[PDB]
Amino acid sequence: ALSKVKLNDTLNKDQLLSSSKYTIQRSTGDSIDTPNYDVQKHINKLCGMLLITEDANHKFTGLIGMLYAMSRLGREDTIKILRDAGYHVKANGVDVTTHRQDINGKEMKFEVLTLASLTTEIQINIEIESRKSYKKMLKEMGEVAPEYRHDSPDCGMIILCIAALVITKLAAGDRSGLTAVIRRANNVLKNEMKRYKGLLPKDIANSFYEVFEKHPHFIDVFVHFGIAQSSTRGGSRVEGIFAGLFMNAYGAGQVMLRWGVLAKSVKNIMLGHASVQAEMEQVVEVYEYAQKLGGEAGFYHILNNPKASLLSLTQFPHFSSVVLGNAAGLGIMGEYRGTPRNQDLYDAAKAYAEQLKENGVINYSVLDLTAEELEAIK
Amino acid sequence: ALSKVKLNDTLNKDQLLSSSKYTIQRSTGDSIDTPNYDVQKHINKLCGMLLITEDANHKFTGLIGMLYAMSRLGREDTIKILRDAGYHVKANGVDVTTHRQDINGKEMKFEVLTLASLTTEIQINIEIESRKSYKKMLKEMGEVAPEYRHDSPDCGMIILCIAALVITKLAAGDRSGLTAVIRRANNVLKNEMKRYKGLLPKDIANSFYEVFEKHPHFIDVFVHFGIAQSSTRGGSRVEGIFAGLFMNAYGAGQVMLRWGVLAKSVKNIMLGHASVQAEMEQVVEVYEYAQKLGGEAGFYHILNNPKASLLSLTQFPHFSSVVLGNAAGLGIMGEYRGTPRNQDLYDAAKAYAEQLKENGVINYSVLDLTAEELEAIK
RNA sequence: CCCCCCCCCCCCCCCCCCCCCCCCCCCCCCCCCCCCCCCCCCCCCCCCCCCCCCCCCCCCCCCCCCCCCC
Question: How far apart are alpha carbons A12 and B299 in whole angstroms?
Answer: 12
Q: Would you call B228 an interface residue with chain A, using a CB distance cutoff of 8 Å?
A: yes
Q: Least CA distance to A356: which residue of chain B? A: B374
Please report the resolution in angstroms: 2.9
DSSP B34: E
- Which sign does the torsion angle of CA B55, B59, B61, B64 carry? negative
Interface of A with B in 236-265 (CB under 8 A): none
Long-range (24+ apart) CB contacts under 8 A made by B212-218 are B212/B62, B212/B166, B212/B170, B215/B28, B215/B29, B216/B304, B217/B28, B217/B32, B217/B82, B217/B85, B217/B87, B218/B66
Q: Would you call B104 an interface residue with chain A, using a CB distance cutoff of 8 Å?
A: no
Question: How far apart are alpha carbons A243 and A227 in whole angstroms?
Answer: 9
B181's CB contacts (< 8 A; 6+ apart) are B162, B165, B166, B168, B169, B201, B205
DSSP A355: H
Question: How far apart are alpha carbons B21 and A19 in whole angstroms?
Answer: 24
Q: Would you tell me how many other CB atoms lie within 10 Å of the CB of residue B110?
A: 15
- What one-letter code names the amino acid at A269? I
Question: How far apart are alpha carbons A269 and A359 in whole angstroms?
Answer: 14
Q: Would you call A361 an interface residue with chain B, using a CB distance cutoff of 8 Å?
A: yes
In angstroms and rounded to an integer, the radius of gyration of the C-alpha atoms of chain B is: 26
Contact B351, B343 (CB under 8 A): no
Question: φ, ψ for residue B3 (rounded to 5)?
Answer: -65, -15
Of the candidates B41, B260, B295, the beta carbon closest to that of A12 is on: B295
Q: How far is A161 from chain B (nearest CA, A)?
A: 22
Mutate to test the interface with B, among A9, A15, A22 (most CBs of B within 10 A): A22
Q: Would you tell me how many other CB atoms lie within 10 Å of the CB of residue B193?
A: 15
Question: How far apart are alpha carbons B256 and B312 in whole angstroms?
Answer: 8
Of the candidates A29, A279, A306, the beta carbon closest to that of B230 is on: A306
- CB spacing of A13 vs B72 below 8 angstroms: no
CA distances from B191 to A200, B77, B148, B152, B182 (A): 31, 33, 12, 14, 15
- CB spacing of B240 vs A8 below 8 angstroms: no
Measure A335 CA to C6 C1' (Å): 9
Question: How far apart are alpha carbons B273 and B347 in whole angstroms?
Answer: 13
Contact B134, B143 (CB under 8 A): no
Question: How far apart are alpha carbons B307 and B14 in whole angstroms?
Answer: 7
User: CA nearest A53: which of A163, A118, A150?
Assistant: A150
Q: From the DSSP assignment, how many helices (H) and strands (E) are in chain B?
A: 16, 6
Q: Least CA distance to B77: which residue of chain A? A: A22
Measure A190 CA to C50 C1' (Å): 114
DSSP B248: G
Domains identified in chain A, total number: 1
Number of Cα atoms under 13 Å in the Cβ half of residue A246: 23
Q: Which residues of B66-97 are buried (b: 16+ CB within 10 A; e: fewer)?
A: bbbbbbbbbbebbbebbeebebebeebebeee
Q: Would you call B367 an interface residue with chain A, using a CB distance cutoff of 8 Å?
A: yes
**Nearest 10 degrees: Cα torsion A189, A193, A196, A198:** 110
Domain with B338 in it: 1-378
**Beta-strand pair A32-34/B32-34:** unpaired
Hey, is A152 helix, strand or coil?
coil
Q: How far is B30 from chain A (nearest CA, A)?
A: 24
- CB spacing of A22 vs B228 below 8 angstroms: yes
- Output the 3-class SS for A71-103: HHHCHHHHHHHHHHCCEECCEEECCEEEEEEEE
A346's CB contacts (< 8 A; 6+ apart) are A321, A322, A324, A325, A328, A340
Contact A201, A162 (CB under 8 A): yes
Measure A53 CA to C42 C1' (Å): 129
Would you give the distance in Å from CA B268 to the centre of its chain? Answer: 31
Residues of B in contact with A303 (CB under 8 A): 233-235
- Output the 3-class SS for A286-324: HHHHHHHHHHHHHHCCCCCCHHHHHHCCCCCHHHHHHHH
Q: Would you call B77 an interface residue with chain A, using a CB distance cutoff of 8 Å?
A: yes
User: CA nearest A293: which of A18, A23, A85?
Assistant: A18
Obtained via which technique?
cryo-EM
A226's CB contacts (< 8 A; 6+ apart) are A164, A167, A242, A243, A246
Question: How far apart are alpha carbons A55 and A87 in whole angstroms?
Answer: 37
Contact A225, A74 (CB under 8 A): no
